[PDB]
């Protein structure tokens, strides 16, 4: 879209007008372009060839028959008294055409040695070359046919084709539309090398043609944003005429195919000056040419034979019969130049950049003209580019330029396209660059790029040229001085940053959670925000599940994955499947990223004027229109949790491993969490815990549902955990332990409870009854023998009692144990074992 291809010979030619003898190596030219801000995507040298590669004329053709595809035994005149008999398989040439012949002993790019061959029962004393085989172009369906008069038979092929040239592929930034031509790039090189520039669009290079009257009746609606519209006829062109080889070659090297002299000239001048041109068959124009907007539902068939559905924002060129062109994009087939066109009306117009951009994007037409208008075309060279086209076409097509000219320049007519002047201090570029440039550096560089600078003491008044609409503010001028003086002269000094506060508590906690999970055996992945197709249908989630309320992307890379992630599990499970499916069956993955949980339908906020600061209410409105995006931590486990070794066969992943992942995240966050049984898909309802911080729910953990595992292709027993880190408050505890020097008392209590009673509820009841003497409690036995009873279990806890100021007796600890026993009997219905 921003590509600009041009040969170095053409680029050197324009620079050399004002700098005779200027010539640089392609390596130095590449560095200079990069140093001033022009990215060189590729440097493609033509050829090279060696040996007998000459121009020939096909004098006779013999159609060798009897084979699958037609073969031609050709007699080629290479400029001597002995015609060479060459076999060829191409069919895009006739007797009398000029071709490029590689004779035996020649070398073609790359390393292809040419010699006499015995093909199709004949003797091939050479080879007729194609554009691709000569490294001149990409055409390979046929051989290269030079236009008549390009060269005589026997001329050096490398010289006629200009294989010593070098093609430069540039990527022009959208702020330098003036560089999408040989004119602008030559001006840039003239600035970089401090040379005198002769503008190829000036009146000296393009002397104006006569203006004796109107060329065609024109009605322009100014609401379409057109700044200029010029018309000049060229009558009496020869339909049999063809563009000379020097013109077709420069078009080919610039990436444009030659068709007819009328169109070839318009493309050539567009590449030379930067003003897109179009040739209309004047004999097919019916009445007054009108420039207006397209009406609703109006259609137009462009010159490629495709019907275009137009919009009311599209600028059209119409007559009394039909639409003549899509303003600034592509002409129509009605007034298109054909093989029998004798009278041509040339169009030179300056369209609105924004209107052309919207039209060419809606119709998917990034033409050579469109991608130049949307980057602003110099409105001052329209007649210059027009006269350049007329005089060139009349010379090569044997036509005659009409002395008539229509030049609509607005209402009222604009005779000066100068942008508004800019006031800037003379030392402003010095301050931004941190360099003390020599005296007059800012004024000299701004005058090189075509601006007029006047001095008012210490303040400069700069008026940029018409081809530089990117220069509106003093900062735009600063870039011009800094880039032409070279950014390498800017020194390296460290800024005076104030004392900072470092990482926030949330940023610090995110590191600690990542370290703890990694040191515990989990492998971090980068979760993709795009959800897999129908993953919630695989999970069996209800239609009203909050996780289904997703945010969808209009243009995703995969159309079946438009929704954004409300949970981190689908990305982890997809990464889990990748590892397991590739031989890594024992894996524990984790991720820390945000989710997208909207609270309403996608509602946007209008454009706030950027000329001021948005008010605090407008900032709060922009935040309320965005979906909630909290930080989540999640993990998935499958296979062996502990690997096998000399200790034993290892331990497969169980739900407790996911529960332990919760306590690892909790300890890393320095918060206390509680786990409670919950039924929450996609987890196993009997092996799923809901994690709470105090009384706020922060996530779930456990083993996944066996049905979800089957439908998702997951390993059996797969476990998962997901927590909302934003729902976990950042804690900064300040403990003050009192280490008691007195001995402890060790006792064990065995309590029998119902099977559904959580072991933590019993421990919490024991602590609540034991009091402050209880220093530690730990479960170490869960017995479900037949002497316990059906649906009942026995729990044995190790108790450690210690007083802070005395030595306890066994009765003192037993009194605390008995009080703990009564508390368990009252809260969880525990019965003392016995």
């Amino acid at each position: 879209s921003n590509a600009m291809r041009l040969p170095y010979s053409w680029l050197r030619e324009v620079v050399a007008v004002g700098a005779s003898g200027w010539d640089v190596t392609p390596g130095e030219l590449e560095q200079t372009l990069l140093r001033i801000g022009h990215e060189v995507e590729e440097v493609i040298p033509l050829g090279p060839v060696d040996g007998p590669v000459t121009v020939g004329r096909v004098a006779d053709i013999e159609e060798l028959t009897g084979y699958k595809k037609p073969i031609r035994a050709c007699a080629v005149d290479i400029g001597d008294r002995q015609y060479r008999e060459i076999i060829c398989g191409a069919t895009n040439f006739a007797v009398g055409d000029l071709v490029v012949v590689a004779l035996p002993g020649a070398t073609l790019p790359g390393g292809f040695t040419i010699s006499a061959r015995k093909a199709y029962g004949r003797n091939s004393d050479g080879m007729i070359c194609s554009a691709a085989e000569l490294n001149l172009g990409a055409d390979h369906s046929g051989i290269l046919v030079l236009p008549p008069g390009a060269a005589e038979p026997g001329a050096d092929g490398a010289g006629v084709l200009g294989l010593d040239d070098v093609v430069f592929h540039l990527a022009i930034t959208p702020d330098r539309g003036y560089c999408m031509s040989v004119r602008g790039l030559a001006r840039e090189l003239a600035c970089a090398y401090d040379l005198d520039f002769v503008d190829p669009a000036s009146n000296s290079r393009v002397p104006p043609l006569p203006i004796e009257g109107p060329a065609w009746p024109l009605t322009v609606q100014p609401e379409t944003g057109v700044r200029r519209f010029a018309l000049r006829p060229v009558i009496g062109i020869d339909p049999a005429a063809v563009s000379p080889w020097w013109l077709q070659r420069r078009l080919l090297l610039c990436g444009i195919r030659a068709t007819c002299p009328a169109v070839d000239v318009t493309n050539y001048v567009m590449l030379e000056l930067g003003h897109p041109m179009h040739a209309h068959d004047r004999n097919r124009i019916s009445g007054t040419l009108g420039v207006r907007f397209a009406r609703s539902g109006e259609t137009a068939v462009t010159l490629d034979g495709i019907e275009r559905k137009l919009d009311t924002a599209d600028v059209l060129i119409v007559d009394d019969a039909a639409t003549a062109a899509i303003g600034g994009v592509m002409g129509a087939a009605s007034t298109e130049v054909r093989a029998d066109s004798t009278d041509v009306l040339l169009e030179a117009a300056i369209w609105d950049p924004a209107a052309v951009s919207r039209t060419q994007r809606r119709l998917h037409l990034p033409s050579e003209a469109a991608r130049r208008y949307e980057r602003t075309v110099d409105p001052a060279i329209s007649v210059a580019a027009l006269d350049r086209c007329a005089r060139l076409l009349a010379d090569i097509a044997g036509g005659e330029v009409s002395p008539t000219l229509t030049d609509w320049r607005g209402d009222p007519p604009c005779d000066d396209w100068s942008p508004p002047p800019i006031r800037m201090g003379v030392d402003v570029p010095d301050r931004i660059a941190g360099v003390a440039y020599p005296q007059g550096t800012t004024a000299r560089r701004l005058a090189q790029i075509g601006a007029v600078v006047t001095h008012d003491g210490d303040t400069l008044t700069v008026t940029p040229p018409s081809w530089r609409p990117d220069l509106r503010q003093p900062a735009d001028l600063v870039e011009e001085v800094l880039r032409l003086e070279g950014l390498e002269v800017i020194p390296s000094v460290l800024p005076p940053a104030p004392a900072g506060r470092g990482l926030t508590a949330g940023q610090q906690r995110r590191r600690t959670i990542g370290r703890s999970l990694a040191l515990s055996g989990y492998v971090e992945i980068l979760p993709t925000p795009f959800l897999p197709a129908g993953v919630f249908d695989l999970w069996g989630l209800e239609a009203d599940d909050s996780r289904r309320m997703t945010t969808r992307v209009l243009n995703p890379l995969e159309a079946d994955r438009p929704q954004l992630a409300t949970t981190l599990l689908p990305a982890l499970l997809e990464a889990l499947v990748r590892n397991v499916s590739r031989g890594l069956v024992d894996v524990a993955l984790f991720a820390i990223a945000q989710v997208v949980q909207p609270t309403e339908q996608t509602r946007g906020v209008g454009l706030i004027p950027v000329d001021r600061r948005p008010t605090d209410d407008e900032i709060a409105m922009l935040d309320a229109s965005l979906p909630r995006q909290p930080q989540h931590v999640a993990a998935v486990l499958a296979g062996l949790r502990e690997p096998r070794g000399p200790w034993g066969p290892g331990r497969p992943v169980e739900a407790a491993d996911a529960f332990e992942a919760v306590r690892i995240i909790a300890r890393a966050s320095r918060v206390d969490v509680t786990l409670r049984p919950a039924q929450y898909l996609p987890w196993h309802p009997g092996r799923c815990a809901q994690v709470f911080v105090g009384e706020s729910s922060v996530g779930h953990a456990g083993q996944l549902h066996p049905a979800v595992i089957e439908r998702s292709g997951l390993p059996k027993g797969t476990c998962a955990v997901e927590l909302n880190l934003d729902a976990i408050p950042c804690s900064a505890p300040l403990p003050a332990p009192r280490v008691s020097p007195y001995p402890a008392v060790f006792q064990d209590v065995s309590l029998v409870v119902a099977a559904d009673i959580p072991a933590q509820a019993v421990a919490d009841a024991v602590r609540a009854g034991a009091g402050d003497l209880l220093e530690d409690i730990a479960l170490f036995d869960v017995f479900t023998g037949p002497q316990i009873g059906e649906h009942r279990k026995s729990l044995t806890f190790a108790l450690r009692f210690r007083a802070p100021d005395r030595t306890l007796t066994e009765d003192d600890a037993s009194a605390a144990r008995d009080a703990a026993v009564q508390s368990a009997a009252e809260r969880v219905g525990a019965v003392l074992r016995g």
């Binding site: 980057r375 992307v553 243009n555």
Partner: protein, 49 residues
């Protein structure tokens, strides 16, 4: 300073949030975070996103 209907913004292909013309998208850069910092914090600002 992205101009609308311009190659400096139109060519910047962005994951836009459905439906069309919602003025909501997936960020192509963390520069909007730099905009929020200038609106929220006092000068001078030395921030990394």
């Amino acid at each position: 300073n992205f101009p609308a209907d311009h190659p400096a913004r139109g060519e910047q292909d962005t994951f836009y949030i459905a439906p069309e013309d919602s003025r909501q998208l997936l960020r192509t850069h963390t520069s909007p975070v730099q905009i929020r910092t200038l609106l929220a914090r006092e000068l001078p600002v030395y921030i990394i996103s």
